[PDB]
């Protein structure tokens, strides 16, 4: 089982609390988010930009 099963490509920062990084080889690279609003855990997709950004802003610090 993977740790995400759908990934949403509509989620922003705003909306996320933090990013949790998964390194699994058996579904690849995944990571999980909670919506700030009602605390919920949704998975995030790896491709958008801002997550890039999330992840060299905390590389580099």
């Known amino acids: 089982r993977c740790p995400c ?3 949403e490509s509509h989620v ?3 909306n996320v ?3 949790k990084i998964l390194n699994t080889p058996n579904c690849a ?5 909670r919506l700030k609003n009602n605390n919920r855990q ?3 997709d790896p491709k958008l930009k801002w997550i890039q950004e999330y992840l ?3 590389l580099n610090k």
Not at 29 to 33: D, E
């Open 5 to 7: 099963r759908f990934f």
């Open 12 to 14: 922003a920062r705003a």
């Open 17 to 19: 609390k933090h990013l």
């Open 29 to 33: 690279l995944q990571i999980v988010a």
């Open 42 to 44: 949704v998975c995030i």
């Open 56 to 58: 060299e802003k905390a």
